[PDB]
């Protein structure tokens with residue numbers, strides 16, 4: 001049965017919560033336990049109230065993203081197909097209760113400083129159910145780092161890390177992320193010069209440029225194990241395919257074209273589409289502290305431009321990693 005919030009967020013951990021993000025889904029906080037930052041994602045489920053303008057998921061509707069979270073986290077401990085590029089999952093609980101006042105305090109601070117698009121989550125009753133996911137703290141999202149990265153060399157590392165993680169997940173799980181906008185790419189400092197992955201038994205490395213990338217948010221994702229497919233069936237969603245003002249919204253339409261509106265099928269080209277959207281952000285929206293003012297850096301720039309104009313002719317992230325010149 002469900003647990004109280006205090007099971008997940010004992011006093012000291014609750015007291016250290018600061019809000020770090022949000023979506024229609026709910027709220028994300030950072031806190032600390034055993035000297036280590038963690039992120040806490042809180043999603044209301046099973047109730048009748050609109051939350052941030054949308055109905056709450058049922059337990060059946062939230063289960064896919066929980067299952068996918070777990071499977072992708074477990075890739076850090078696998079052998080033939082191994083990656084640390086998805087967010088580590090520490091725990092998942094079903095919680096019952098009204099929203100903790102200390103979290104409302106945190107929510108108010110964020111609203112006062114950054115502003116929120118969400119409702120203040122102060123209207124839940126003591127029978128309300130939530131899913132609370134505790135993950136690794138992944139750093140800061142790529143969108144928030146628009147003006148904060150060193151150079152396009154950093155961009156190349158980020159694209160290589162993303163492509164490798166997606167390829168490993170394609171190979172192990174027939175995974176498609178399906179919503180890899182730049183809010184879902186997280187960046188954290190690492191002292192490691194090289195990051196490691198293994199793809200179908202072959203290990204390789206990626207120069208880090210001082211950053212470790214984590215992919216988050218599996219609300220639209222798909223994967224399979226032993227022919228049992230876990231996914232979000234958006235075949236009858238209207239609003240998802242009618243966005244404009246950002247290439248992001250075209251990707252939803254391009255996925256629907258690719259899969260003929262059949263979301264249970266495996267179409268790893270969707271991962272290529274998202275990687276193209278991210279490359280497009282790197283070239284058109286990101287601004288770097290140091291420009292390509294040297295010939296070796298002008299060459300990295302040319303290679304990322306070449307990637308942008310050629311990558312849509314590849315079938316999967318696996319195809320890209322193994323065959324594209326950017327990664328040789």
Ligand SMILES: *[IH]c1cn([C@@H]2O[C@H](CO)[C@@H](O)[C@H]2O)c2ncnc(N)c12
Pocket residue numbers: 020021022023028039041087135136137138139140141183184186216217
């Ligand atoms: I899971 C997660 C989510 N965030 C932040 O919240 C936003 C909405 O999901 C994201 O765009 C991002 O800014 C996280 N930040 C750090 N670490 C984790 N695990 C996060």
